[PDB]
Amino acid sequence: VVQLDDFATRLYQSKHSVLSEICDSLETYEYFLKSLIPLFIDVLKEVPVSFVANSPENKLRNITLEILHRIDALQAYSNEIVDTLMDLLKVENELNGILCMKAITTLHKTQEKVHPFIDIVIEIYSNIPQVVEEQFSKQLAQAMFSFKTLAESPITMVSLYSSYKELAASSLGNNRANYGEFIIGQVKAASFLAYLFIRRQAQTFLEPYQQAIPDIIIRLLQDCPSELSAARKELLHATRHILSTDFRKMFIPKIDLLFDLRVLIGEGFTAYETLRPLAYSTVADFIHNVRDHLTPAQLWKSVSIYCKNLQDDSLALTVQIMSAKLLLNLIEKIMRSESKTESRQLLMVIIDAYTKRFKMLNSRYNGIMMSLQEYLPIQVSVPPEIDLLKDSRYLFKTLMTFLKTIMIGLKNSNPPNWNETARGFSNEDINILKSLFRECILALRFFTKEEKDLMEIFATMFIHIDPASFNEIVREELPFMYKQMLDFASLLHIPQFFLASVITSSSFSGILITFLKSKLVDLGEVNIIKSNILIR
Amino acid sequence: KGAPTALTDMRKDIIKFSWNYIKLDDNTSKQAAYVVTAYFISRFLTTRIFVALLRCHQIDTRYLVKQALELLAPVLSERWLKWPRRVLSETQVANIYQLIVKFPDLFYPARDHFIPNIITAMGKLTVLENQQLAIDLAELILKWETKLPFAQREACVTFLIRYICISELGKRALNILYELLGPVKLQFFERFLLGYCLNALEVLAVALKTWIIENVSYLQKLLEKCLQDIQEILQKVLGIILEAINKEDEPEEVTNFISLIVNIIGVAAGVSLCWTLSLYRPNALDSLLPSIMRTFNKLCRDHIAEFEAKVTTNLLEKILNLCAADQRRVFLSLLAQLIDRS
């Protein structure tokens, strides 16, 4: 066509004349493709090696990538791509092998050369150990992705485990910029371990002759330099996928001992921003899924670090409710331990940790009726677009649901009709119940069957708890509840249920009738809404 | 941003603080010195900042880079755009360039030939949350059409019609497609669910903003293969059909075929079609005779109690009562039964 007339006339100067004509023709068929394939064989013949130059050899790769960017078509192309990837492969040659592997990925998307390329990748991985001893590798990252893509595209039954033995024999041991470039090759190994992660947990098993498989991961979370943030994001997603299948999860209660899976892995501030809601969710479900092999030193270290995310208003919202649901489903190991009072002294930390989240919910209510950080110039992320009123109703609805199941587990943890309704509370422990009654009353200001449903969940938590120590909580919080009951008449349902045919009717009605005899003199003088409530 | 009149000797070594923090190693406090140097350049050598702001970056600094360019561009023309054009020869790294040829386009209409190739790349990016950015790029093609003002512009509208056919924001894009057509389509409507009805909705919109009579004969074959959303599409179709009737024998056959479709309904869509038919045509009393029998069964079901259909049938009975003025006895009896109802 017209692209062949402009290029045959244009067949540093003529390389710029050919590449600009090819880029314009690509901006603009098969006969021009086969003619350019003959021109590509002449272009690849002259100076196939690079030695990283500022000369037309890089422009020769630019016109070759221009042929790759445009589109025996595939047979002569794959023979030329394997020939260019033959010379200068397992050394620091150029980035032309990345364009060659991308062209090989485009050719394989449409068979014996793939077995030769996998053999070329295995020897380059074998020669990677000698190159690592030389510095005692960017093509290894490109060959890791391309090989996996080709395997997914076609068939991989016997040669997949054959290269996996070469992948089992891959790199496992170990100036500042050259050490970081060697760490960039180690960063390529983490992307290469993602190919080891995707094969090990997708569908089926493989050659299971491997026992140091957790040792090649817990090491690599530690010595991974925190410069490249996406290198650790895929390495966290490497462990996110491996800790989902059951046969690989049991390897982790070995020499890790669930002890090196804390937040000394999220080092840099560039990883401190958004990699923490990922680095917390992989360890929240993993701790829930095991629920075994846990010494109570670990059970304290897991119940401490996962309520210092609940009381942290810098993470997110939906990762605060994930960190609350963990402590709910962790009660089946904490309650079912021995009655050494460690089943009670652990459950009161969690009830404290839900008390100190209802407190922060009540600070922002009058602010709805340091919250201005959007006027700050250098915004560091996408600003949140969610409102405050709907999700605070959503958080309080969910946290009251989780709270009743913990307080049922308080009923069984009684110290020596014992262990049924009666329990001994210390004075250090009744002070955190009085701030649970005070904040649950106060967080119903965010208001009717929807809020009257929570008043069932709030009162039923306080029925089954020790009516010698229930006459103390409701006595101190009755002058406080009457003050909230003036501006909100819906809170009148709470004392209505506390005496509605229950085990507290014989004691709450005597406490209430002592209270209202004091306000009997102050009935003739108040206005309507205080006198309406008082006769109710 | 707040005190430019503080001093000027401290302005000399802002660069001794800010440009020193360009050479960091992370990806967030390295970028944060690109933004604090963009407030200082935008007050009063500035080539090396904005040639590296649009360079190849990862998807980590999406909101971080975009705020550093938008505060830099009004002083850039004060101090040309070959470096934005040079990076087009080398996808995901285009959207940073695209958003600075999106907002401050008072000077962007200089070399719009690459903008047409970017419009060709816009459809390639259209093939996700970036579809809203692609619709912004589709609005940018209307903006570049509003900035520059060929045959590729009609081809760009064809890709934009196919983008609307691939599908809110598209309704605003279809309104932008209607404004672009005013400033193969029948074969595209013959080739093509609800988007095909939306494609038929845009076809009548392109027909508005004789030859319309023979096209209505082709559209009568199109309406025969078609006759809620179909009622809404036919309501726009009858407005295009009655506009040509407002100014021959082909219009009598299309009225008889819809009356046969009204006989096929006798369900509520035919009453909606008859209301659009009686909206701009005088004589429909022959179909209104069996329609009064259908509305009598509709009023019997309405009196026994589809509130929108009964209100439309009451509007159909309101239109039929004005047309009837010999079933006036049965119509007034059902009206009194409706008056006696709740």
DSSP A382: P
CA distance B121 to B117: 6
| Helix pair B169-181, B151-166: axis angle to 10 deg | 150
Q: How is residue A192 written in tokens?
A: 């290469």
CA distance B275 to B317: 10
> Under a CB-based contact definition with an 8 Å cutoff, are residues A253 and A243 in contact?
no
CA distance A449 to A473: 26
User: Which of B21, B23, B25, B37 would best serve as a mutation to test chain A binding (most A beta carbons within 10 A)?
Assistant: B25
Angular region, B56: left φ>0, alpha ψ -120 to 50, beta rest: beta
CA distance A32 to A314: 59
CA distance B130 to A519: 65
CB contact under 8 A, B60 and A229: yes
Of A178, A92, A79, the closest CA to residue A131 belongs to: A92
CA distance B241 to B216: 7
> Under a CB-based contact definition with an 8 Å cutoff, are residues A478 and A515 in contact?
yes
**Cα B235 from chain centroid (whole Å):** 19
Q: Which residues of A touch B62 (CB under 8 A)?
A: 382
Residue spans of alpha helices (H) in A243-275: 246-249, 269-272
> Under a CB-based contact definition with an 8 Å cutoff, are residues A384 and A441 in contact?
no
Cβ neighbour number for residue A87 with a 10 Å cutoff: 9
CA distance A461 to A459: 5
CA distance A148 to A128: 19
Q: Which residues of B touch A278 (CB under 8 A)?
A: none
Of B291, B285, B293, the closest CA to residue B330 belongs to: B293
Of B230, B216, B166, B222, the closest CA to residue B189 belongs to: B222
Resolution in A: 20.0
**What are the E-state strand segments in A290-350?**
none
Q: How is residue A326 written in tokens?
A: 């963990």
Q: How is residue A4 written in tokens?
A: 């062949």
Cβ of A51 under 8 Å from any chain B Cβ? no
Q: How is residue B225 written in tokens?
A: 């293969």
The position carrying tokens 């407002």 is: B246
CA distance A401 to A413: 20
Number of H helices, E strands in chain B: 21, 0
Of A470, A469, A468, A450, the closest CA to residue A459 belongs to: A470
Q: Which residues of A touch B92 (CB under 8 A)?
A: none
Out of A27, A227, A381, the one facing B25 most closely (by C-beta) is A227
- What pairs with residue A418 in β-bridges? A422
> Under a CB-based contact definition with an 8 Å cutoff, are residues B236 and B204 in contact?
yes
Experimental method of this PDB entry: cryo-EM
CA distance B135 to B155: 17
Of A521, A514, A344, the closest CA to residue A432 belongs to: A344
Q: How is residue B199 written in tokens?
A: 């494609």
CA distance A283 to A277: 10
> Under a CB-based contact definition with an 8 Å cutoff, are residues A406 and A324 in contact?
no
Sequence-separated (6 or more) residues with CB below 8 Å from residue A358 = A396, A399, A436, A439, A440, A442, A443
Sequence-separated (6 or more) residues with CB below 8 Å from residue B227 = B234, B257, B258, B261, B273
CA distance A118 to A123: 9
> Under a CB-based contact definition with an 8 Å cutoff, are residues A325 and A402 in contact?
yes
Of A272, A221, A273, the closest CA to residue A242 belongs to: A221
CA distance A414 to A424: 7
CA distance A128 to A138: 11
Q: How is residue A153 written in tokens?
A: 């595209």
Please tell me whether residue A422 adopts helix, strand or coil conformation.
strand
A137 residue type, one letter: S
CA distance B140 to B156: 12
Q: Which residues of B touch A382 (CB under 8 A)?
A: 62-63
Cβ neighbour number for residue A33 with a 10 Å cutoff: 14
Please tell me which residue of chain A has the smallest CA distance to B29.
A270
DSSP A492: G
CA distance A373 to A359: 21
CB contact under 8 A, B67 and A269: no
- What pairs with residue A422 in β-bridges? A418
Cβ of A28 under 8 Å from any chain B Cβ? no
Q: Which residues of A touch B29 (CB under 8 A)?
A: 269-270
3-state helix, strand, coil in chain B (%, to 5): 70, 0, 30
Please tell me whether residue A458 adopts helix, strand or coil conformation.
helix
What DSSP line would sit under B51-63, residue for residue? Answer: TTTTS---TT-HH
DSSP A252: T
Please tell me whether residue A418 adopts helix, strand or coil conformation.
strand
CA distance A464 to A524: 38
Q: How is residue A475 written in tokens?
A: 């006595």
CA distance B70 to B68: 6
CA distance A512 to A520: 12
Sequence-separated (6 or more) residues with CB below 8 Å from residue A263 = A276, A279, A305
CA distance A354 to A310: 8
CA distance A436 to A357: 10
- CA atoms within 13 Å, Cβ hemisphere of B218: 10
> Under a CB-based contact definition with an 8 Å cutoff, are residues B137 and B98 in contact?
yes
CA distance A113 to A481: 80
CA dihedral B334, B337, B338, B341 (to 10 degrees): -160
Sequence-separated (6 or more) residues with CB below 8 Å from residue A145 = A191, A195
> Under a CB-based contact definition with an 8 Å cutoff, are residues B263 and B290 in contact?
yes
DSSP A91: S
- CA atoms within 13 Å, Cβ hemisphere of B139: 15
CA-based nearest distance B85→chain A, Å: 14
Cβ of A417 under 8 Å from any chain B Cβ? no
> Under a CB-based contact definition with an 8 Å cutoff, are residues A74 and A39 in contact?
no
What DSSP line would sit under B200-252, residue for residue? Answer: HHHHHHHHH--HHHHHHHHHHHHHHTT--HHHHHHHHHHHHHHHHH---HHHH
Q: How is residue A398 written in tokens?
A: 């969910």
